[model samples]
Target: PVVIKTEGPAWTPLEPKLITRLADTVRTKGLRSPITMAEVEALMSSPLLPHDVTNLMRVILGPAPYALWMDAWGVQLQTVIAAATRDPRHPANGQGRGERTNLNRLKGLADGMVGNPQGQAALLRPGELVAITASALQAFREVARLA
Candidate 1:
């Protein structure tokens, strides 16, 4: 069977934003070719660095990498709590075994600001927890009294 093979600009067309940025980076860096991520990282912050990639590094893996900036990403986001609960010390000390902590299908929450693929509102620390729990309690009371 004969099949057509795609090639040319069609082979590597990029999104307008991304390709535009690539060109911008090239122009900004005054480069020809042969550069490393470290090269770019040294001089420029990645679009998703502080908020996305490193955020996942900590939340998804949980403060294990001895190196990497995310190692120091200190916070007790729900994700961070999930990681802490997994530690031999925390759970082994007879903690985090409760249903609410049920090893919990526990996924990464949204970013503190941008909310990324989760694409919802985001907050940080106990403030995030307080918002949901208090809002629900307040709503429950109102609805309960009325209905």
Candidate 2:
């Protein structure tokens, strides 16, 4: 980066040219309520999702990941991870378990995904997960906004 003006309280005029405009006066949002776990449940049951997302929901959910969020059922962080990371063919306890340690972005949203913050795995926001699914299914552009 070039230092245009090193001196403090100094002014330097630049010759205006094409595309010299700055993006300004954009519409911004104000205060908004946080997304709660109950909302997460509603997001699942309400089904405002599109066709592709619905299809991936089936694959990503596998046997019972959604319920893992809905109820405790003795579900732990690792157990929920096992469900979301499952490969359908192997079903439960599929590959990428323990092998991929970081687990990237599984962090469950607001107030906690399942139980309290005490247990339960990191699950992404429903829409964000949908974007990830689109990326997984070879739709790169779908995730561009999220990035």
Candidate 3:
């Protein structure tokens, strides 16, 4: 069998409103309506940048199933995180392990954020988490890369 590969689109900061509209449309129209991936990408690409490709893929994987697209998305997302935060001296600067002061601060913030009743209730499923987190992470990754 030939493997046919494709993607949705790379997200841009300017695409937020349109993205929301598209998501709403999807929710109302249902997934079986057969929207073309190309169309979706086109909608998103009005403001895309080449650097967004990785993060965009990461977003798709987050809310995707255990299929080809999702798997690759997760891999790319993890790769970005690993590359961006490989050290432990500072929470923003590196991948922090438990017990260090910086690590504790990071953990504390995470705990607080997740523990907030509204925040906890708003938690995304693994897939949703993947998509949104990847996008947000992508934004930061861009910042890191540009600095």
Candidate 4:
């Protein structure tokens, strides 16, 4: 059965205005030339809060990503993603596996979803994933904010 993803409590931002404001701040600051480590750290911070963005950013960051200073929030966010996207057969259009498999795959991903730095498929810390997520979001937010 195809399942529609929905939001859960954990994924909600602590303060959306804060996020928006930060995004604006980063944009006005204008991601320094060559992307400094401090800038990268700041950008990756908020993206980590949102689940969908986190996953997308993870892919964008490639293999080695940055880490967040705090991880409690990440754990909560992961729980929310797992709950909202609870469908086993999400990708089941000709794939042998059924919804059960799809759900399991999602579940499997939660741990690793938090992150994987080496590109070797190892489960990574929430903080590390957050860093990468932040950087990618920063790049996108720059354009988004400006536009």
Prediction RMSDs, each to the true structure: 19.7, 18.6, 14.9, 14.4
Error of 2 at 78 (Å): 1.6
Q: What is the lDDT of residue 128 in candidate 1?
A: 26
lDDT of 1 by residue, 77-118 (tens): 244355445663432122334323211111224332343322
lDDT of candidate 2 over 90-125, digit per residue (tens): 222224433321123323233333322222222233
Q: After superposition, how far is residue 97 of candidate 1 from its true place, in Å?
A: 39
Point out the worst 10-residue segment of candidate 4 by lDDT.
1-10
Better of 1 and 3 by lDDT: 3
Give the candidates in order of lDDT, highest first.
4, 3, 1, 2
Residue 106 in model 1: lDDT: 18
Report every candidate's CA lDDT. Answer: 0.29, 0.27, 0.35, 0.36
> Candidate 3: where is the Cα deviation over 4 Å?
1-12, 36-39, 44-68, 72-147
- Among all windows of 10 consecutive residues in model 2, the one with the lowest summed lDDT is 18-27
Q: Estimate each model's TM-score.
A: 0.19, 0.18, 0.28, 0.27
- lDDT string, candidate 3, 72-101, tens digits: 434554454454355444223422353222
lDDT of 2 at 122: 27
Backbone clash pairs for candidate 3 read 62-127, 62-130, 62-131, 63-127, 85-95
The lDDT of model 4 is 0.36
TM-score of candidate 4 versus the correct structure, residues matched by position: 0.27
